[PDB]
Each structure stands twice: as C-alpha cells, then as structure tokens.
Symmetry: D2
Subunit: 255 residues, 4 copies
C-alpha cells in the first residue's frame, strides 16, 4: 500500500477528532495527494490548522454542502481542473437533528427523516456520479457507516434508517459502477468520540459496553478507520466491492 | 380465526394489488376490514372489489401518505367510525419510472427523496397514528422486496427505499415493543401488479424465479395474504422486527 | 386448522421441552401426532404427557439420530403404522457440558463432531427418510438459536453446530423444493428447558432479554408452537429456506 | 503494508494454482518469513519447486494432516522451536468426497458430512489453539471460505454446510481469542480454477455467471486473495475481527 501518485478527495473533516482526519493522516503518510471538502467555514479554519501536521505541500480545499446539487457538481468539476483525475473519494458525512437522536423513533417528523436521508445517504449517490467523471480509468469510493444501519440500536433512531439506506446505496452503486472499474464500499466504524457523537443519546454508555463486551475488549480510533480506508482505497482491495468492513473490535459479530 | 378483529389495509389499487390478496384472506378469516386509498380510481375499484368480500359495510378513507394531516385525520376518523384496531397492513410504495431502469448513479435528489417519503417514512407516521387505536397492542406489517437486501438490476432507487423500510421496521419494533405493538415485514417475491409494470426488467425476473427458486414456481397475492394473516394474528405473538420472505425460497440461494 | 394432517415430532424429553409446546399447539389444531424419543425416561414422560392431549392413540418410536439404522427403520415403521405424513418438527440437539462454557478454542475434536452429528447432520438424514412419507409435499421445521448467527458467550460448540444446522436448512430447502417439501427453522429465544440447564450463563441471557429485547419479556414453548403451526401448514406456502425468530425481537437489535 | 520481521504459517498449498500460493507470493513480496504446511508428499514436492520463485532464503516445510491432533500439536511445537514466535496463520484447507459435491444434498452420508466438517471447519479451532502458544503478543488468523456457506449454491452441497460451520468457527474464535489480541477473520473467495475446484459439480458454469453478473464483470484470482490476506494479517486491519471479507467481484452483494 504505497500511495505516491494517488490523489483522494476526503469529504467531512470538521476538526482533529473527525474520522476523516484519521483517514487523512494515514493516506498522507502513505504518500497520497489529498483534496478536502468542507461545509462550515469553521471546518475550513480547522483544515488550515491541521494541514500543518500533514506532508501535503498544497492546501486543496473546497466548500461543498452536499444538500446542493450545484455545489457538488461545481465542486468536483473545479477539483478536476485544479488536480486533474482522482483515484478515489472518502465520504465521511452524516447529519440529523438532535431531537431525532434520542427518545422515540415513532415520533420522528417527515422533515427530520428526509433531512438525514438527504445528507447521509443521497449525498453519496450524487458524489459518485460527479466523482466518476474524474475516474475514467476506475477508482475507489468508501463511505462511513455504523452498525445501527444493520440492527436497531436504541437512540440512533433516524440515523440508523439513513445508514441502512446508505449501506444499500453502496451496494447499488457498486453494481452500477463496477463495469467502469469503480469499486464502492463501506467502513462500519465502532463508536469514536467526535463532535457529531456528542449529539447522540447514550453514546457514552455504548463506548463502555464495547470495552466490556467486544472481542478485543477495547474501542477503536480514527487512525484505525484510516488504515482500513487505505486498504479499501488502494489496489490491495482490487477484487472487493459492495462490501462493508466493520472496524469495531469485533462487536458486530457477537450478541 | 379473526372475528372481532379489525385491520386497516392501505394500498389496494385493483384486483391484482398485493393488498387485495391480504384482504381476501383476512376477510375469509372473519376479520372486519377498513381500507385506505390514494387515487379516486382506487375508491371506484375498491367499491366493486368489496362485492367479492364478506364485509357488511364499506369503510373507505382517502389517505395520501405524503400528507401528515391526511394520515392523522384519516386514522382519527377510522377510530371515530370503527373503534380500536388490531393492526395495519402497509402495502404502499412509489418511485418515478425513469428511476426503475438505467443507471442508479443517475438518480435525482427529488426522485430519491420521493421514494423514501412514500415507501419508507410513511410507515413511521402510520405507526405513530395507528398506535392511538391500539391501546392494548397490535400488529403492523409492511411489504418489502429482496432488492432492499441485495442490489438487483433496475430496482435501483426502490432498493435503497426498501433497505430504508426494512430498518424502519426494526426501529419501530424496538420503539413500539413495550406497547405490545409488533412490526414486521413480508418480503414478497415478484407478482404481476399495476406497479410491477413500471419496473425495468420485471418479466425476466419472474421467469428466473421459476427456473432457479427452490419451489421452482412464482408466488401470488393470496400467499402474501396468508403470511399476513399469521403476522397480524396471535399465532405470531413472539415475533417482531422480523422480515419473512414469501418468495419460493429465492432469498436463500445464490 | 390441521385435521387430517399428520406430523412427526422429534425430541420431547418432558413437559418443558420446546417440542411439547409444538405438540400442544398442533394437537389443539386437530393434527394427528407421532413422537420420537431417545431415552427410556423420555418415553415415560411422553406416555404421561399424552394424557394432556387429544391424541386418541400413542404413536411413540425410539429414534436415536446417531444411528442411520434407527432413523431409517423408525420412519419406515411410522409409514407402515400411519401412512403418509405432512411434516416433521425437529427439536434435537446435544453437546457435552464442558463445551457450553469456558474457551471455545479448547473444544475437542470428538466434542465438536458429536455436536454436528446430533444437532445438524441428523436433520439431513431425517429429511431423506421422511421425504419417502411425503410423496405429495410437506413441511420440515428445525429449532435453532441466534448463537448460530452470532458468537454468544458460552454457547461455543453449539453455535457452530447451529450455523451448520441453519445452512442445512437452506440446502435441504433447495434440494427438496422441486418435490414440494418446504424446509425452515425457528430461532427460539431462551426458554427454561432440561438442556438449557447445561449451558453456561443461561439465567444471565434470560434476564437480558427482559431488559433489552423489543417486547421486554421472554417467550415460551407455546409461542414457538404457534409459529411451528404456521410453518407446518399451508399458511406458509411459498416460504422455504427461512429462519423465523421467535425471540421477542432480540435478533433485530444491538 | 511491510512485513519484515513478521513470520507467517501458510497451510494448504498443493501446487502453483492453490489460493494459498497467491497468499504466499504476496506475503513473500512484502518481506515476511514464511513457514509452509502440507499433507501429501506431492504437495511438499510442489512446495519445494515453488520456493525458487520466492524470496524466502530458507525452506520451512511441515507435514500436517489436520485430521490428527498429534500432527497439529507437534507441527506447531516444532515450528516454534525452529523459527520462534509467529505473527499469524493462513488457513487454506478444505476437503469433501467427490460423491457429495453434486446431485442431491439430502443424500449426503453421515461419514461424508462429518469428514467435511472435521477437515474444513474443526481444523481451524485446533490450529488456532496450537498457534496461540506462538503468539504471546497477539497475531492474526485467516481462513478461506466461499459464498455457498451463506446461501444454498447448487452442487456445493456438503461443503456449503461445512463453510457455514467454518464461518461460525471464525466468530466464536474471534470472541474467544480477542482478549489475547488474536484477530480471526475469513476471506470469502470467488471461484478460482484450482485442483480442488476440479471436483466441484458445475464450477465452470459459475465462473461464467460471475463474469456476466458480478459488479466488476470479471473473475478474481489467487493474488487478489493474497492481497486481502496481507491486509488481514498485518496491522492495517487492527480493529477488524470476526469479519468475512468477500473477494468476489461484488457478487455476494447482488441477487
Ligand atoms: N464517531 C462515530 O462513533 C461514528 C461511528 C460510525 C460512523 N460514523 C460516521 O462517520 C462519519 C463522520 O462523522 P464523525 O463522527 O467523524 O463526525 P464529524 O467529525 O462531526 O464529521 C461529520 C461531518 O459531516 C459533515 N456534514 C454534515 N452535513 C453536511 C453537509 N450538508 N454538507 C457537507 N458536509 C456535511 C460535517 O461538515 P461541517 O462540520 O463542515 O458542517 C462534518 O465534517 C459520519 O458519516 C458518521 O455517521 C461515526
Ligand atoms: N408486486 C411485486 O412483485 C412486489 C414484490 C415485493 C414487494 N412489493 C411491494 O408491495 C407493495 C404493494 O405494491 P403492488 O405490487 O401490490 O402494486 P400496486 O397494486 O400498484 O399498489 C401500490 C399501492 O401504493 C399506493 N400508493 C402509492 N403512493 C401512495 C401515496 N402517496 N399514498 C397512498 N397510497 C399510495 C398506490 O395507490 P394509488 O394507485 O391509489 O395511487 C397503490 O395502491 C409495494 O410496497 C411494493 O413495493 C411488490
Ligand atoms: N431452550 C432454549 O432456550 C432453546 C433456544 C433455542 C433453540 N433450542 C433448541 O430447541 C431444541 C430442543 O431443545 P430444548 O431446549 O427443548 O431441550 P430438551 O427438552 O432438553 O430437548 C432436547 C431433545 O434432544 C433430544 N436428543 C438429544 N440427543 C439425541 C439423540 N442422539 N437422538 C435423538 N434425540 C436426541 C433429547 O432426547 P432424550 O432426552 O431422549 O435424550 C431431548 O428430547 C434443540 O434443538 C435446542 O437446541 C433451545
Ligand atoms: N478455488 C475456489 O474457487 C475456492 C473458492 C472459495 C474458497 N475456497 C477455499 O480455498 C481453500 C483452498 O482451496 P483451493 O481452492 O486452493 O484448492 P487446493 O489448492 O486443492 O488446496 C486445498 C488444500 O487443502 C489441503 N488439505 C485437504 N485436506 C487436508 C488435510 N486433512 N490436512 C492438511 N491439508 C489438507 C490440501 O493439501 P494436500 O494436497 O496435501 O492434500 C490442499 O493443499 C479451501 O478452504 C477452499 O474451500 C476455494
Ligand atoms: C446509540 C448509538 C451510539 C453509538 C453511535 C456511534 C456514532 C457516533 C457518531 C455518528 O455520527 C453522526 C451521528 C449523527 C449525526 C451525524 C453524524 N456524523 C455515528 O454515525 C455513529
Ligand atoms: C428487477 C426487479 C423486478 C422485481 C420487482 C418486484 C417488485 C414489483 C413491484 C414493486 O412495487 C413497486 C415498485 C416500484 C414502485 C412502486 C411499487 N409499488 C416492488 O417493490 C417490487
Ligand atoms: C449462553 C447462551 C444462553 C442461551 C442458550 C439458549 C439455548 C438453550 C438450550 C439449547 O438447547 C441445547 C443446548 C445445548 C445442548 C443441547 C441442547 N438441546 C439451545 O440450543 C439454546
Ligand atoms: C457450485 C459452486 C462452484 C463454485 C465453487 C468455488 C469453490 C471451489 C473450490 C473450493 O474448494 C474446495 C471445494 C471442495 C472440496 C475441497 C476444496 N478445497 C471451494 O471451497 C469453493
Ligand atoms: N445527554 C444524554 C441524552 C439526553 C436525554 O435525552 O436524556 C446522554 O448522552 O445520555
Ligand atoms: N437449574 C436449576 C434446576 C432447578 C430444577 O430443575 O430443579 C438449579 O440449578 O437449581
Ligand atoms: N452453573 C453456573 C456456572 C457458570 C460456569 O462456570 O459455567 C452457570 O450456569 O452460569
Ligand atoms: N464434471 C461435471 C459433473 C456434472 C455433475 O455435476 O454431475 C461438471 O463439473 O459439470
Ligand atoms: N499486526 C501485527 C499485530 C497483531 C494484530 O494486529 O493483532 C501482527 O499481525 O503481528
């Protein structure tokens, strides 16, 4: 897994604790050129500060709010003009309203339900469609999911149904883009202390249950999602598509 | 035996609807049935199809599941008219036709979100409203397709809406379980219906089922109805969060 | 309604066996019932338990499923005595107690193979022999546990046997499907039985079900019985190679 | 990856086309010390000739029939004494009688059935038990499976039920050895032309179906399984255990 002469777009860094910064440090250390997308100007300010830890000689930064077709379309097109063709996209983007990450799922509003779908699942479909234009030789696209996608986890609620939708999105994109040699896959990460994790009810007690109950008896971190991302995004994983790799101390496998 | 049971059946359009197969089976088991419909033609179709059933009266409500208010008022009127219900059969899905053929990666945001709204979110607001009519518990069944579990050619945006539906069922089962409301899905094999005409490559898939599925034949609406009767009755009292494939065994092979 | 149906039920040891749950329900629905047992003690228990059923006669056959000869002769004798049958409920498993606690990685070879033989292989041979007694179709159900789908502390050698049993169901479904023989599984939640007493950590699991599973209660043998009746009747036509969890929704959550 | 100063045991090379030789070329390229185990004297012969293609400076070959506890126990003890501690095991071993790999599964004999379980699933348990003693610090164990363990595949019959058992074995071993920092996983390989594959009914038909239907529209090869093995056997997959990674052109993800 030497990645010199590769270029990857990383979507969804907000600060030093983001899962996408884990990916970024791993890829950067393997020699990749990196392009970052963000939403909030605060995330750009964090990226400028974090970029000083990386070996990248150039800040390639683009504001993409994935709710806007125009911004995705113009964002990727612009990326293609500044760096030319890419080898892969790491997608690390989800959002739901805090009301909807606690209490009763049956009480979820239409607008909350569709908001999480839009940002957390559809963004992947239109990103694949646009990033595909920069991968005429093929490449690799990886999104971040959680076990809540496969089973009902108390409190994860509307996000779990968005992650179900995302994981199917990965399977349908993989079938669609396979003949173009673009592999599509998901990493199912265990709980990691990030900014978004702060909004999820019961997150702390899940972290503890992982330590007690998961095969490795410990929580995973961002760099460990990064290591698996490096695998998924490179030729080491050349025959692998439509797959979901749980980076979660084995927790998915037990009951 | 379903006498003194009352069930709301959403999503009959014509004689071929999966929901009419459920209706005949419940009706034949002695249940009292209430029906919900979107289009005017389905009311008309319904009024004529009801002559085949045993129902001594025609309890019909127009509900478009895209409107909260219609679902809310609908179920409020059902309560006022009929009393407490024992369950809900949800047989509703939609996507635009261009989205059911060609490249999934080309799906529009509108088309993607439409399908989620009608095909997945609707179960959630239905379950919320119907719960008010089930104070001593009941049973909610939704209809899905193997396409929510695996990427099936052409099924595209509906596959991702079904994956969403199937998780919606799990989260509702967890949430509503303490109220003794069970929520399950029937994953139906391919059956010729109004909507089935709209899915790219449906005929080819029909034939593959007979060639390749363990039972070597296709299923029909009455077979979905029979498993609905199970899920909606006390025979399934211990079962919730489940997805039962009524598909000649096709899910189990590869 | 199962009048004029005949089912073989394998693996009743006493009044708490899951298979007795199945028996009561089928008996209540009018089925003619044949029983198989291994231990002397289990026949005695069976003779007493029949006084609770409407079975007008006692059809008891000793079959140790470790013996090909006993399964072949047992089923051939059942055919001479009652004619064609409509299906088989398989409620048989076994492992040595030291393989239901401690470290899985320390399982012996004979212990591993013993559990496979009795708990999984036995279905293949029963299905072969019983096929002979169903020229017209039927239904075969085996009993499994969620520890065949996930690693569950202590369940150890039996979980690997259940993984193998649930695959056995799928291959039998595929093989016997053209013959109109359906093959399915019930994945039952924990239930206090004689066998359950030898599994490390059983009470802990039973209690976690009440706290964590969607229905927040445990299931019992009669609820297994009820889903068994569905899977063994025409209500489940079109369903084969399936695993239905009767476990209060525990399988759907994490 | 980079595997210098790592030592791996590879079980189940028969000839140049064995999946396990794919695994060996990739690890050897990456700097690992390799120890090889075989059953037939013919496999040892092949092994000795295939070693000239490899960078290994030293042949470490051990006869182990996994039907015998003593050969497993003694084999690993001797490996122990000869090379010191090891970093993981690649398990590439299965067997079923020809009788049982075609026609009707319901006709499978008890002896055929238990034979497939004993060699194809139990072997992993005892290997893991014996290999653990050589991994005081942790390590990684990988077994090779096939999609017919998750779904009924026509003709794969008794071996399907053995692969189910194997895939459960991997989860139960992951739960058990996790606290020792030993990870255990499976690679679900797509159809590959091997000695053993010649005895499976309908194998050519499936090859063709993969090319027509699988997302990547092509079959995979031994090196592609090797490359995912290097991922699983190395630190890149820290955090991953009890997992099954399909190297099969996305075929598992579609219906
Ligand atoms: N932490 C965990 O335990 C965990 C576990 C499993 C999976 N995941 C998944 O990991 C991914 C990364 O989340 P995280 O935990 O690392 O949280 P995070 O650091 O808060 O990152 C989430 C990112 O989502 C971006 N985002 C939200 N809406 C967006 C929009 N409309 N357009 C563009 N970007 C948008 C945010 O950008 P702005 O801040 O600039 O708005 C932010 O950078 C998510 O997909 C999450 O579901 C997290
Ligand atoms: N047929 C199959 O092979 C198959 C297989 C597996 C699963 N399914 C599922 O079975 C269910 C029923 O479909 P079907 O095949 O029986 O086709 P159908 O007869 O065309 O029924 C679809 C129903 O959905 C209703 N519907 C659509 N949007 C609605 C809305 N916004 N509000 C209220 N009702 C709405 C339609 O009502 P109007 O026409 O009145 O608008 C129609 O009654 C669907 O969920 C489908 O996904 C079908
Ligand atoms: N209880 C639970 O929580 C639970 C949960 C999930 C699934 N299950 C499954 O349910 C089934 C029934 O078990 P149970 O809990 O009802 O326990 P049980 O009452 O103790 O019954 C187990 C039966 O297996 C029979 N059996 C064992 N070895 C046999 C052999 N060599 N030949 C013929 N019969 C043999 C026993 O007969 P003899 O007494 O004559 O030896 C006994 O009747 C098993 O498959 C079990 O794995 C149980
Ligand atoms: N080829 C495929 O399409 C495919 C697909 C998915 C998974 N797999 C799996 O890949 C693994 C390797 O098989 P393969 O396809 O590479 O075929 P292969 O080259 O024939 O290798 C199978 C190996 O199994 C060994 N083996 C069998 N019984 C043994 C015993 N009792 N003790 C020790 N070794 C024994 C054989 O050694 P001897 O020659 O010395 O007897 C041989 O080296 C198997 O687990 C297989 O199920 C294969
Ligand atoms: C009850 C479950 C607790 C464990 C949750 C782990 C986790 C933490 C953070 C996650 O990321 C988001 C969650 C909601 C909204 C946006 C994001 N990025 C996320 O997707 C998953
Ligand atoms: C290539 C796949 C062919 C098999 C499709 C079977 C099917 C048929 C009808 C279905 O129902 C709908 C499909 C789309 C839009 C609305 C509905 N109700 C549906 O959800 C599934
Ligand atoms: C640690 C897991 C706790 C829950 C176990 C539930 C259970 C209980 C009894 C079961 O039946 C047997 C178990 C072992 C040996 C034989 C049988 N019949 C069985 O198969 C499963
Ligand atoms: C009907 C579907 C055909 C596809 C089979 C692919 C395959 C090929 C070879 C395999 O390896 C064995 C199979 C049987 C016996 C021993 C081995 N090693 C194996 O395990 C799987
Ligand atoms: N802050 C709470 C959730 C808030 C609640 O709804 O009580 C937690 O993380 O546990
Ligand atoms: N498991 C119970 C047995 C109770 C009984 O069967 O008497 C105990 O150990 O006391
Ligand atoms: N009899 C105890 C012992 C636990 C064990 O050591 O297996 C139990 O059932 O949990
Ligand atoms: N050698 C034949 C066997 C045919 C059969 O499965 O019986 C094949 O591989 O196709
Ligand atoms: N990767 C190292 C450490 C083991 C582990 O990843 O658990 C090895 O295989 O030696």
């Amino acid at each position: 897994v030497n990645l010199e002469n590769k270029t990857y777009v990383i979507m969804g860094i907000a600060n030093k604790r983001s899962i996408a910064f884990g990916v970024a440090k791993v890829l950067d250390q393997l020699g990749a050129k990196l392009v970052f997308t963000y939403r909030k100007e605060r995330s750009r300010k964090e990226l400028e500060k974090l970029l000083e830890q990386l070996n990248q000689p150039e800040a390639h930064l683009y504001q993409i709010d994935v709710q806007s077709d125009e911004e995705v379309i113009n964002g990727f097109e612009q990326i293609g003009k500044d760096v030319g063709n890419i080898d892969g996209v790491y997608h690390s983007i989800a959002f739901a309203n805090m009301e909807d990450l606690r209490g009763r799922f049956s009480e979820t509003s239409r607008e909350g339900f569709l908001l999480a779908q839009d940002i957390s699942s559809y963004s992947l479909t239109i990103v694949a469609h646009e990033a595909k234009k920069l991968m005429p030789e093929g490449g690799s696209i990886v999104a971040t999911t959680y076990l809540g996608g496969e089973f009902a986890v108390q409190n994860y609620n509307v996000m779990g149904v968005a992650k179900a939708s995302l994981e199917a999105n990965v399977k349908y994109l993989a079938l669609d883009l396979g003949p173009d040699n673009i592999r599509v896959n998901a990493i199912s990460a265990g709980p990691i202390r990030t900014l978004s994790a702060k909004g999820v009810g019961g997150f702390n007690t899940i972290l503890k249950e992982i330590e007690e109950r998961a095969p490795l008896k410990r929580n995973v971190d961002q760099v460990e999602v990064g290591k698996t991302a490096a695998y998924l995004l490179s030729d080491l994983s050349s025959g692998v598509t439509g797959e979901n790799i749980h980076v979660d101390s084995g927790f998915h496998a037990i009951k």
